């Protein structure tokens, strides 16, 4: 069974995941070292890639190689980030935004795959959403304590999946479906290789956010 797309991807992106857990921006975040301005930008970055990613998934919502993975009800974060961008920046937020150069590359790549290698879109949904379902609960608590944020969710409506009531088993439904997709082994390897690229896109954002400290 270690031949399932979800199995391949896990073993296939292990090294990249380790780099992510240990990247200085992530460790300094978890310790509560990141202040508000670097949090407002972290969110800003998050917004783009997820808005872009969701518009792109919104595009192939009925594609044979992505159809099931489509889950606007349970996953999409744009409605959440938006409310979060409203809390920190305010309704005016829109007329202020500016993405980390890396976030830009990230998005452009989310668009390329958007019409060129569509059978690899799952690599971007996987990397981002699945991670979100694994430790979002913890990140929410760290963010609230360091920035003195309300427990009622203000500013963090992003780290919470209102429509998902059980992350653990939820991701299983996702793995069961990722594997169900009609895919040849040749492409899967391209998917795994694409998930790894995706982590690096996040690695680059994490890298740019750190320097932002100075």
Q: Using CB under 6 A, list all residues that contact ligand HEM.
A: 6, 9-10, 17, 20-21, 26, 30, 126-128, 130-131, 134-135, 199, 202
- 171 among the known binding-site residues? yes
- 63 among the known binding-site residues? no
In the complex, the smallest distance separating the C-beta of residue 213 from a second copy, rounded to whole angstroms, is 10
In the complex, the smallest distance separating the C-beta of residue 165 from a second copy, rounded to whole angstroms, is 36
Best CA proximity match to 45, nearest among 213, 156, 201, 214: 201
Nearer to a second copy, 22 or 184 (CB): 22
In the complex, the smallest distance separating the C-beta of residue 124 from ligand HEM, rounded to whole angstroms, is 9
Alpha helices in the chain (DSSP H): 5-12, 14-22, 24-30, 37-59, 78-88, 101-112, 122-125, 131-146, 167-180, 185-211
Angle between helices 14-22 and 185-211 (to 10 degrees): 10
Give the whole-angstrom CA distance, residue 211 versus residue 65: 38
Return the structure tokens found at 97: 């935004």
Return the structure tokens found at 184: 């040849």
Give the whole-angstrom CA distance, residue 212 versus residue 195: 26
155 with 88: CB under 8 angstroms? yes
- Residue 105 binding target from a second copy, ligand HEM, none, CB below 5 to 8 Å by type: a second copy
- 190 among the known binding-site residues? no
Nearer to a second copy, 66 or 161 (CB): 66
Return the structure tokens found at 18: 């380790």
Return the structure tokens found at 95: 């007329």
Return the structure tokens found at 206: 């994490």
In the complex, the smallest distance separating the C-beta of residue 54 from a second copy, rounded to whole angstroms, is 17
Nearer to a second copy, 124 or 171 (CB): 124
- Residue 204 binding target from ligand HEM, a second copy, none, CB below 5 to 8 Å by type: a second copy
Return the structure tokens found at 152: 């009622």
Give the whole-angstrom CA distance, residue 33 versus residue 185: 43
In the complex, the smallest distance separating the C-beta of residue 59 from a second copy, rounded to whole angstroms, is 11
Nearer to ligand HEM, 86 or 109 (CB): 109
Which positions lie near a second copy, rule CB under 8 A?
15-16, 19, 22-24, 101, 104-105, 108-109, 111-112, 115-117, 193, 196-197, 200, 203-204, 207, 210-211
- 126 among the known binding-site residues? yes
Residue numbers belonging to the annotated binding site for heme b: 17, 126, 171, 175
């Amino acid at each position: 069974r270690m031949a399932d797309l979800s199995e391949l991807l896990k073993e296939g992106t292990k090294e990249a995941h380790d780099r992510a857990e240990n990247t200085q921006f992530v460790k300094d975040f978890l310790k509560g070292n990141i202040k508000k301005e670097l949090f407002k930008l972290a969110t800003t970055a998050l917004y783009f890639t997820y808005s872009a990613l969701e518009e792109e998934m919104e595009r192939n919502k009925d594609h044979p190689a992505f159809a099931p993975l489509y889950f606007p009800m349970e996953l999409h974060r744009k409605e959440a980030l938006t409310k979060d961008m409203e809390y920190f920046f305010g309704e005016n937020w829109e007329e202020q935004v500016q993405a980390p150069k890396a976030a830009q590359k990230y998005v452009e790549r989310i668009h390329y795959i958007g019409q060129n290698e569509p059978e690899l879109l799952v690599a971007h949904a996987y990397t981002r959403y699945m991670g979100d379902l694994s430790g979002g609960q913890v990140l929410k608590k760290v963010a609230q304590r360091a920035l003195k944020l309300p427990s009622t969710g203000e500013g963090t409506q992003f780290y919470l999946f209102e429509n998902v009531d059980n992350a653990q088993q939820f991701k299983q439904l996702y793995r069961a479906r990722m594997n169900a997709l009609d895919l040849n082994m040749k492409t899967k390897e391209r998917i795994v290789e694409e998930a790894n690229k995706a982590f690096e896109y996040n690695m680059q954002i994490f890298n740019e956010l750190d320097q932002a400290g100075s």
